[PDB]
Structure formats: structure tokens, C-alpha cells
Amino acid sequence: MISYDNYVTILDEETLKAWIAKLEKAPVFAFDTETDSLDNISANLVGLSFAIEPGVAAYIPVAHDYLDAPDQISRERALELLKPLLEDEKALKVGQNLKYDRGILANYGIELRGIAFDTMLESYILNSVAGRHDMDSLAERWLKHKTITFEEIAGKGKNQLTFNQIALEEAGRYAAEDADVTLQLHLKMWPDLQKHKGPLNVFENIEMPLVPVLSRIERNGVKIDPKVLHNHSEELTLRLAELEKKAHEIAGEEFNLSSTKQLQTILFEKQGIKPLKKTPSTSEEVLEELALDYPLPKVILEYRGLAKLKSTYTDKLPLMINPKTGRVHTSYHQAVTATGRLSSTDPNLQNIPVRNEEGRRIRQAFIAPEDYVIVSADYSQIELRIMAHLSRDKGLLTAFAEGKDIHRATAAEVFGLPLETVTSEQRRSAKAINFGLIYGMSAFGLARQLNIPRKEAQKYMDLYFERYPGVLEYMERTRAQAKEQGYVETLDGRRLYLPDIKSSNGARRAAAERAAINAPMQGTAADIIKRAMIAVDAWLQAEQPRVRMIMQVHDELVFEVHKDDVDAVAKQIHQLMENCTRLDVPLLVEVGSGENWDQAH
Ligand SMILES: [Zn+2]
Ligand SMILES: [Zn+2]
């Protein structure tokens, strides 16, 4: 175990002050906030734990209120004594997911500064795909030490105790060990992080500074109109009933909208070709092929889609409105993607259909408060611009340089015809190629997306590579370093480790290769987006203008800008994003505004 002998439980000021004194002279120290909820904005601080060095940690319980809880330093007293240390930018702190702790202290008017090391981000930058980056996994992985699990002290299910109900000493064991272990983890990882300037730069200048900005974005939240969302729900229910009647009307009898069961016995039994359509999917969708002529597969397609959308955003979103703010606070994950892109949950902003009407109606529900407007700043096809840069292709670079539509320019070159005359089919073909390249898509895969025969796709690809040599070179040079060094990195040095690069297995290695070509571009976009956030947030914090960065989805940053400041701010956001980030990639930021996210979008 870990007993009560390990860490002191600070129950008096004198001892707290003694610790604060020791904390002031420690080179770095790890600390944790303990609370009664995961919901940052409404969580209450139950106590704090600090680690001055390995083995020396303490828990200061401030709000444990179970039956007969012993006297504790009051939260306010503890916080006013601790405040100076926490706010001192010179006092360097280490923590596991400091984003969370920074937010909790903010609930008390304390501005956590000195957010120097986050063991979570250390782990993530060391090797994003090494496994899970939570304390329990880290402690075991790096220290062969199994930390006291939260469940161990709190329990499970509905009857799980909140921290304030847990006995002082038990709470002590958990909090102090966590603080202790975080410090040890940092001590093991920090040295490693310096063995390579790449990862080091990323962690230092990209990940770490992003911590307080993510906290700020999450705590600000986004205004969602529940009324609009409910109307949408109602309408969707009517559309589902209607589409369902239309389904039955096209065939005979009633049936679920489930393939490999009901649809095949109808569709192919009424003429068509036997294979169904898996919902794999983004390569062979038999249902939408038939849709250009066959009516039934067309309605089943739209029905399921609307069904998915309704339950996920229409029915859920209103439930996510925080009673304390009356806003939705999405949870961004800084250490989850293999590439380094921020992901999002509750809600997963990225799964809201972009090119679809219903998705648009969802975005319409993301509204600007009175006298404010939504401002969307998007990096126009940044990944394609990155690829142009990475491949040093003058063709692509020039296309972007002279503001031409690369998909049309690509088509103009691949199919050899004037830019003004490239047709939508050709532009769409060049587009399938362009984006196919980012994901390292095989010629056969491109054919499946373009509905053209194999080798016809290959014909297009050979013609591309001939007209755009740099891209092939890039692809080859990337697959090359991938095998030689087992990893690929972004312009900022962010690394993605490809263990199955020499897999000796087929598809597993193939995957590693697609990842090899893709990650540098996707990862670089991530890096850029993160630097834009830091840059923008810095201006926000310094100049204090009437604007809130409320979202980050894909390559766009979304704000709430005061209507009277829109222009000045629009200019400023724009310059910050396409000028105060990397200066090597030809970047373009499309800024838009409107009454809601869909409008600015
Ligand atoms: Zn993008
Ligand atoms: Zn510009």
C-alpha cells in the first residue's frame, strides 16, 4: 500500500505556512486541486496536495464535510495564503492535466501562473501513441508503481463518493501520492524530453502554453439555443416518420431500415446487385451508388443519417447546457490524437456534418449573445498548403501564391486544359486526388471514391506525379525516413511514432505507411492551429478586447466578438493567425461573421 505514514495532512496554518515557505524555494513542485466534481465551472475545491520532492508531499483538506469531519483550514484562508505562490509566474508547477487545476483556481479568482510542466503532455509529446496518458498508466509505465485509483477511495457507480465525503486521511493518500508521483514522473520524463529539440520545442512552445488557453475556451463555453434545437428535434421526428412512409411506399409492407436483414430482401430482390452497404464504409457504399437513379437506397441513406444526427446533437445538446452558465462547455483533449490535433467531446464538435444541410442547422443553434456576433476564422485548406510546402512543388506553391483554386489548378495541370475551362467533374477528380494524397490513399482507394475503374485512377495519379514531381519525392522521402528512424515529424518537430512501419504484416504496415505520409501534414496543421490559439489568446489576455474564443474545430477558431468591434477584431484575428505562426507555409485565413456559427461559417 501507501499508508497514512507517507504524507502529512495539513490541518493547521502554521504547518501550511511552513510548507508554503518550502514550496517557495523548491525549483519546481507538483500540485493538485481536489474537488467535488469533474464539471470545472461548478466544481468546488475540496483540498490541495503538493509535492516538494520525491517522497515529500502533503494534503491540505479544506472542504471535507462528511459527518463529523475534523476541523480544517478554511478554503478561503488556505487560498489567500496559497494565492501568491500559485499566481507567481516564477514559481514553477508540475501537474497531471493542469488545464483542470487552472480552471478550479479560477473559480476563486486565482490566476494560476507558472504552468510549466504537465506530465500528461510530457508523456504525449514523448510518444503520443505509447498508450494512455493518465496518471495510473503513467505511474505504472514509467515507475512500475500502481497508484491508488480514484475508484479505490471513492467507489463506483451512482453511489460513488465525491471527494468532500472521503475521510481526510484517505483523501490524503490519494491526493498526496498523486502529487508525489506526478513529480517523479516529471523527473523521469523531463530529461528525456530534452534528448531531442523537436519534441522539446513542441512541448515547450506549443503544448504547455496551450494549457491555460484550453482552460479558458472550455470555461467560456458556447451559447446554444435550446429552442432552435428542440424545433429541429420535432421536425426531425416528422421527417423520420415521412421518410419512413416513403420507404414503405416504394416497396411493399413495413420494415426496419436495417441492411443485411430487411433491405437486401427488398432492394436486390427487386433488381440490383447482391452486396449490401456497410455503415469499409467510406470506400464502398452500395446504397448511395444506386441513389443516382434508384430512389429507395436514397431515402434509407438520409433516414439513418437524420436519425444519427437527431439523437447525437439535436436531443443531446440541450441537455449539455450547464445550469451555472447557461452555456455548453465542450471538453477538448490535448493528449489523445496520434497526430497532435485537438479532439473534442461533449459535444464532439468535429462530427457535426460540414457539407450537409442538417449539420448546418445544428451550427445555427450556436448563437452569439446579445450585441455580439459569431466570428469564424478558418485556415483555408491548410493541409493542402502544408503538402505544397513539404513537397516544395513550385506548381502547387504558385497555384496558392496567385490565389487560384488548387483543385481547379491541379485539374488544369493533370488534365491539361485552361483554368477557366476545368469542369466540375475534373475539379472534383483533382480534388479527390489532392485530398487522397494527404491520407496516402492507394490508387484503388481513389477509384472507389471517384467511381472510376482501377488503373483509370492510376492514370490520373501518374499524370499528377508527373505534373507535380515534388509531391512524389515528398511521399518517397517520408516513407524512407519513416523506416530508417521509426517515426515522422512535423515542421515544429512533433513526432508520430510508426511501430508497424517495418511490420512484416501487410495491411498493418500499409496503415503505418499512410500514417507516415499523412501525419506530417495533419500534425503540422495541428501545430499551426495550436500556435494560432496561443497567439490569439495572448492578445486577448493582453489587450482585453470584447471577444471570447469559444471553439476550435478542424482548422477554424470560433469567437464571440462584439458587434461594434467586429472589423477591428476581424483584422486582428486574421493577422495573428496568418502571420504570427509559422512563416514558411503559405497560410490563408478566411474570416466570417454572423448571428450564429452557421452564419459565420
Ligand atoms: Zn483542415
Ligand atoms: Zn491576409
UniProtKB/Swiss-Prot annotation:
Region entry Klenow fragment, spans: 1-601
Enzyme class: transferase
Source species, domain of life: Bacteria
GO cellular component: cytoplasm; cytosol
Keywords assigned: DNA damage, DNA repair, DNA replication, DNA-binding, DNA-directed DNA polymerase, Exonuclease, Hydrolase, Nuclease, Nucleotidyltransferase, Transferase
Domain 3'-5' exonuclease: 1-194
Signal peptide extent: none
One MF term in the entry's GO annotations: 5'-3' exonuclease activity
GO biological process, one term: base-excision repair
Known catalytic reactions: DNA(n) + a 2'-deoxyribonucleoside 5'-triphosphate = DNA(n+1) + diphosphate
Listed EC numbers: 2.7.7.7
Polymerase: region residues: 198-601
Subunit architecture: Single-chain monomer with multiple functions.
Function per UniProt: In addition to polymerase activity, this DNA polymerase exhibits 3'-5' and 5'-3' exonuclease activity. It is able to utilize nicked circular duplex DNA as a template and can unwind the parental DNA strand from its template.
Protein name: DNA polymerase I
Range within the parent protein: 324 to 928 of 928
